[PDB]
Amino acid sequence: TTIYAVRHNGKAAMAGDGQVTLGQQVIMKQTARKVRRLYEGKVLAGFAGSVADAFTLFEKFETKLQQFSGNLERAAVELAQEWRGDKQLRLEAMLIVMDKDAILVVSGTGEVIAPDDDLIAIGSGGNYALSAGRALKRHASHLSAEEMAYESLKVAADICVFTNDNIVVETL
Amino acid sequence: TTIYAVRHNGKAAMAGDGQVTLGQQVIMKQTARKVRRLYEGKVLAGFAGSVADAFTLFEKFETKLQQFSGNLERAAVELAQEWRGDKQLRQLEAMLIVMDKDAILVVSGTGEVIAPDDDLIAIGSGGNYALSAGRALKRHASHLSAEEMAYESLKVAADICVFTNDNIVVETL
Amino acid sequence: TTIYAVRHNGKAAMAGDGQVTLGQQVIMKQTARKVRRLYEGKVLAGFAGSVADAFTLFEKFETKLQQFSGNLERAAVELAQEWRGDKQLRQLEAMLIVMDKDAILVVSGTGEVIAPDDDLIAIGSGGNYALSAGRALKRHASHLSAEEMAYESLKVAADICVFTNDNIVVETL
Amino acid sequence: TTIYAVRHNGKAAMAGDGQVTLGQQVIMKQTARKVRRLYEGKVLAGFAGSVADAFTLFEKFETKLQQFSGNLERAAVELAQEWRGDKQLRLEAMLIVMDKDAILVVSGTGEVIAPDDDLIAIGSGGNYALSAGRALKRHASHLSAEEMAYESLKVAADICVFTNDNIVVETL
Amino acid sequence: TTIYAVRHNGKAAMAGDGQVTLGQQVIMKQTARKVRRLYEGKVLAGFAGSVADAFTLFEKFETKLQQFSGNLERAAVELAQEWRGDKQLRQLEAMLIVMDKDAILVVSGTGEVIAPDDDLIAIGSGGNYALSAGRALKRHASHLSAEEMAYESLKVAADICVFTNDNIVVETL
Amino acid sequence: TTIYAVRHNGKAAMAGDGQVTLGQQVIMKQTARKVRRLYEGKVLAGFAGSVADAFTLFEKFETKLQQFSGNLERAAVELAQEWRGDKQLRLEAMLIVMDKDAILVVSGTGEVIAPDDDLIAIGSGGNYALSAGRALKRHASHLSAEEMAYESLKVAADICVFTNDNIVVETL
Amino acid sequence: TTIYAVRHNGKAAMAGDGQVTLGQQVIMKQTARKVRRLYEGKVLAGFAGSVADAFTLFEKFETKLQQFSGNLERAAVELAQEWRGDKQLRQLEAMLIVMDKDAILVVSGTGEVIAPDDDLIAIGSGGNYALSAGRALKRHASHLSAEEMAYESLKVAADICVFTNDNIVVETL
Amino acid sequence: TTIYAVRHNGKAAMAGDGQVTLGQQVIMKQTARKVRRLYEGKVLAGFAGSVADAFTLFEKFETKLQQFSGNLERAAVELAQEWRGDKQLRQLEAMLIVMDKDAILVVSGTGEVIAPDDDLIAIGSGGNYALSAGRALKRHASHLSAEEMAYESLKVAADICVFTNDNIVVETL
Amino acid sequence: TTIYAVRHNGKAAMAGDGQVTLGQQVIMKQTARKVRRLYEGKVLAGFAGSVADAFTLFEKFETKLQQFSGNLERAAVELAQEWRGDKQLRLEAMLIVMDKDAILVVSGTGEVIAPDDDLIAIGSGGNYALSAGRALKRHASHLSAEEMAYESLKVAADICVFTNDNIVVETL
Amino acid sequence: TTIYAVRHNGKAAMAGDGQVTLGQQVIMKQTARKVRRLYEGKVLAGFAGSVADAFTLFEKFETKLQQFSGNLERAAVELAQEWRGDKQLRQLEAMLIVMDKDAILVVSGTGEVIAPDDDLIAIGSGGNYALSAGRALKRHASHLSAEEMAYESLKVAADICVFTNDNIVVETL
Amino acid sequence: TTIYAVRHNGKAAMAGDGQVTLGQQVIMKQTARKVRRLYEGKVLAGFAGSVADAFTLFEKFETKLQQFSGNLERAAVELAQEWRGDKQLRQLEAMLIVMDKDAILVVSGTGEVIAPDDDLIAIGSGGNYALSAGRALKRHASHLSAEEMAYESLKVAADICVFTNDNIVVETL
């Protein structure tokens, strides 16, 4: 799994692959959709874990956003301390959220991280898309956010055994 | 244990073996019936796991279907979230297979709800072998019926997996 | 990694993928060729482990093929007891597969030598998936040649195993 | 540690960082030189382990090259099966070698790998420089091999805690 | 410990040894009686674990026998899902065996409920040894009564299992 | 620790040593009293664990005896299933109880054991006093219960590093 | 991570780096600000763990600062016994550091509360390296202010600790 | 940490060191005060463990003393049973030392309440060394006062144990 | 397995059971003979391990006895340091040897132990026969050495799950 | 086991207990003599391990005492590097203690050679307890001879260590 | 153990403490001399580890110096390769410090030969603390001599590390 988000030239994008793996060994699905639209379509979210846990956190993050009038950082922080508060969800998959202004990553370890260069990724191949995204932002700034997100996922897909090239890109 | 569901040529079939193994070493039963009919004969379900856990998850799922108006996909996800929260029923190992005349779904104890792209999938220790046979059969032997594909895929899994025998029972919707 | 051999209808074939994985996570190569021709082109061999160990065992097996008048079964067995006798290669978890015009054999670090009952067998991460596909094709698609069978069996394994890709090279005898 | 090699437009390069880490926790040196010239300056080699093990393998690889008249692949293969043969050196650090025609990676696990796209890397941050190098080769082919090797190391340096930005680039 | 039940030729019997072992090393008792009569004498039950857990499960099973009009199969299944539902007894590795005039059932901490295909089954350390003896006697010594079969099966297990002695008590129905 | 009980010739006895060991290595006390009188002096009890756990179980066993009119076996059984029921006490030290008619051993594993020959023991050296007690009952039946209990403890004391010879014998 | 506090020559300072590391291998952020101002700007606090836990403990400590008339030592101690009393934060291996105009305190998941003997202390991965630098500067470079001391101590730690960078933010009181 | 109590020649003294160690490797404080006065100066108590756990157990013990009319022995046992039941306060590692003008007691997290036969005892990582010195001193150097024996025994423990220093503070009743 | 030796009233005896257990779970033989005669019938030996290891040590101990003219202690000591010297035999089963004058126990850990009271035992139930043998020597000295050895084994047999009552007693 | 050596007031003594323990649980001997006289009676030596290893090291040390003109310190050091150089005795966790009229030395499997700062040292399970007693007696009971000191130090250790008894044999030089 | 070498202002100094610890818990010596002079007073060497291993590696290094004509760098690398090959002398834990009037070097048991960029470095359990102090001193207290920096850096390490004491001995070239 790899989910990469990038704000570039007033355009925001988030791309994800489609592979689902069981027991770190077998492929069970190739066409999964891991990028979801939240909060009246003003937030692009993604989760590197299971769909049951993803939907549970997506729901709790939506009520936090409605509680704080779309304050992405404050909603993420209280979700993180609520997430760590739960017996069951306290899980090493990470959450990535993004509105028109900020990007954030929320981990089960309670870390809330905003990227320094408006680009970040999660999943088993996230550091590979992050590596390609940074080279693209510096040496290929003529690419759009959607193009950057797609090429970074494609780079990580050829490296990560748990990330395929069935890449879907969502724009805000 | 190997349970396999396939939708082919307008028919739906779910097969399963009958071996019950304890301690990953000893056989105690050879003729178990692992494929059950739910929701007044409209849902075929099976469970890789124990009997009491199967009946528990079977009841919660049928309850979910009546509450969600027969929506298999929405009931499977809600059951998955309920399954993960319950600390007594939480089995990362166990998996659930369900199928109606329209869709097939697998509910993981890890919380994953998977819909097969090719309308065939399997669970259990030998499920990936039946999955391999079924894919080959759907491609190069499409003349076989759904219940024939289900039986032949279970037969291949049984000759490879030590926890799956050839006492195969096929249920057709 | 997946390597699958099949002797079907007077033909022999051995196919392998091309993916090389490090640390069970990262892909370093996609177009590796793991099926090597041995003994004046009369023998096909494959190894599920590393390149260094593959060559070491290939040369030793080639030696004993000259030593035993090209007798695959006896060359395989004494290679197996020397393999186990070496303090180096005893720790290898990968297996070796060899075939000629008349026989298929698998040699292991366990000291195993297996002739398949149906003239088809596989090794590697997804070998059991290609084996299931091959057995289903052998029974319900016997019109396919050995070259198509080995190729189609590998693609089924490639779509399930995360350590096996579709860059499949089929070497026929 | 990260050592990245790339052949591009008839030019060959290999870059390495300078950080040395003890116990995966403390930095002991920042200016180490990890890229060495072998075989009359026709081979660029690098090792992701300790300098004693690096020099030992560098010496055995030089005699193999002189034995096989510069056959990089045949020298690497017999070094790998000799490497696995040794009681002590049988070690999870990897070796990278490169002449004017080929690039190779040799692991203590006996793997001899030639890259598909004339670029590869080793070390704790090697997959990050590999990720940036592939995005650069596709979307910034106007860069030279030396420039590509330097930017890939710099990308991996900002990601890997064991890789610093004291990057030295050697060209063949 | 070994407890073996058999319904053969219109008779039912359940036998158990008497050895109690602590720490898998030391014998504390030799004449324990592990076969208890339940439900107005119409049910025989045995537990391979400790006395405290045996009584706890015996009373709960006796409750559900009154609750379900003496239906063994359904009382066993809901006892199995409550057993698994308790944070206490979920960790128990021992199994429970129950029988009446018409059925034999084994309930486990795994949530298992198994009806034997041949009306004979066993539990405990040497249950598989008594099971093998019972199946051989069922096929080649069918003239023996259920009481002799259960007794002879236990003595075979006692001569192999270090945790099973010859102080065997056969309770017939 | 070793606590041995024996009924012999209408006389009942229970003997215990006095050593207390911390961390299975250091001696902290030599004069501990491990045999206690319960239920109006009609029950001799002993516990092979800590004094806080001993007093807790001694209290729960006394109320069970008063609830069942001195039925030693029924009180022990429901104590055992209550003992296993507790989160904290569910402990590998064992309990030994004895009235004028029966002897019982209750373990944290839920085992309730009456001896076949009216003699039994608990503790790290219990099997050694049990071994000597059985040889004494067969080849030295002229000894009293109190003498038998004392000599069995003394035999176990010279063998078990956690059992000293400060032996106190209580008779019913 | 490294956070170092020092009260020297009538001044108070607390400095921290900016590196955030995941899995002890990968850097996700370089410009984090881990020194937060508390209690109407009269208290500086820092946490070596995650952001969620840092805020949780910051708000609880701020509560007890109002609750105890701004008494750092007593607010720290009762925060420590509540921290240990929570089944959540008991498992936290990181420590908390707090200071006002008169005292410096470190609170741990161990239940520890330590006032430094020389009005200087540090926490985090490289805290002991900044502590050593601070003590050497306190003895042989007492002319430096508390702001320069805390800053220089962090740079020494940054050049040794792989989890501490040079993006140091010094908050003075 | 080493705390040692001795009653000798009509005087009672309890000594302790001042070293606070984290991670069994690093020193953070050298002048801690581990011997506290309780129950209006009539009880000397110390705690091998953390500060927050010490203050928690100190408060529960003083509460136990007021409820049991100053009975040290009955309060120590009741505190021990309360300590074992509380899953949040349960520390098998930690130990508590208490002493009045009549008795000395040690309360273990394992639940043991020990009264010394020779009216001297110690707790902490270096307690057995101070215990060894104190026994030798009470036998062959009885001319020393109780506070002298307490200091000299701590001084011997400090030169042997790496977790105990010579910053010894002696409190006399 | 239990092998017990005792010198008593000028008579020497060594008794052993007959049970052989595989994997600490299953009984494979009930009539094994574990007490062997060595050195012209002047030494009674026993081994608590496998028959292949027993015969190997029995042979090496016989040549040591012939080398030292029947010095039981000196032969046992050099066997023990030779035993620890071997790569394969360096094994937690113990050896027991006995001539007309001394009894010794030799462990794979290099311990050579002569009993203080002319009686000692080895095997999984050795401490139980040792416990009964000491009570018998003190409170039933009218028994012969052969009777004492038999009753001690019989006591250990009813306690140890790995020791049966097929007891053979050999006298010197 | 405890062995303690002391050179005090122109006298030298080495004392040891007699308890032999197997499996850290059971006592096999109570009157063992672990202090052996070496090198024409001019050297006392003791080993905290097994008898076989004690003799092996005793003979090797006696060899190097002849080899080095009875120089204890140099014979000890080269014995230490040969001890570590042997693949056998490298795994020994016990230590060796040697003394003559002028020096005391401890040699370890770690390769350690230590001369005590105060001419007294101990080895074995309770060596640190006898060491503490010896240091207290050296400071506050200097009138005792070396023979009484070594004897009294061992009895203190015997009353604390479960692997050390009171059957103490004091060998004077 | 902490050994620290610094070259400053035309002078070279190497300091070390005197604590010897066994089992990471108990002190056996407080006045050891860990800094040795080699190569006829031209080389200062120290060893974090045991005595016998120090003398062994000291001898092999001096032999390497005579063979390489006093070349510290070439002798250190050759010793490192020799150290890794010897399976009896291979200590991943141990480290070696050497220094002449020109260079400083550290030889790791992991095989690393490091030359400090700032001409100061340290080894041992508390070496990174002395390294932190020394860097701060070279920057903000350059007026101190090399032997003063060596002592003060060891003094800071000793007050933090539990395995390093203040019995510091400084050797100057």
From Swiss-Prot, chains A, D, F, I:
Keywords, sorted A to Z: Allosteric enzyme, Cytoplasm, Hydrolase, Metal-binding, Protease, Sodium, Threonine protease
A GO CC annotation given for this chain: HslUV protease complex
UniProt entry tagged with the keyword rRNA-binding: no
Binding positions for Na(+) per the UniProt entry: A157, C160, T163
UniProt entry tagged with the keyword Cytoplasm: yes
Pfam families: Proteasome
Origin superkingdom: Bacteria
A single GO molecular function term of this UniProt record: threonine-type endopeptidase activity
Protein task: Protease subunit of a proteasome-like degradation complex believed to be a general protein degrading machinery.
Family as reported in the entry's similarity comment: Belongs to the peptidase T1B family. HslV subfamily.
Protein name as annotated: ATP-dependent protease subunit HslV
Native source organism of the sequence: Staphylococcus aureus (strain Mu50 / ATCC 700699)
From Swiss-Prot, chains B, C, E, G, H, J, K:
Catalytic activity: ATP-dependent cleavage of peptide bonds with broad specificity
Cellular localization per UniProt: Cytoplasm
A Pfam family matched in the record: Proteasome
InterPro entries: ATP-dep_Prtase_HsIV_su (IPR022281), Ntn_hydrolases_N (IPR029055), Proteasome_sua/b (IPR001353), Proteasome_suB-type (IPR023333)
GO terms for biological process, alphabetical: proteolysis involved in protein catabolic process
GO molecular function: metal ion binding; threonine-type endopeptidase activity
Binding site for Na(+): A158, C161, T164
Enzyme Commission number(s) of this protein: 3.4.25.2
SUPFAM superfamilies per UniProt: N-terminal nucleophile aminohydrolases (Ntn hydrolases)
Signal peptide bounds: none
CC annotations in GO: HslUV protease complex; proteasome core complex
Enzyme class: hydrolase
Self-association and partners: A double ring-shaped homohexamer of HslV is capped on each side by a ring-shaped HslU homohexamer. The assembly of the HslU/HslV complex is dependent on binding of ATP.
This protein's name: ATP-dependent protease subunit HslV
Taxonomic lineage: Bacteria, Bacillati, Bacillota, Bacilli, Bacillales
Gene that this sequence comes from: hslV
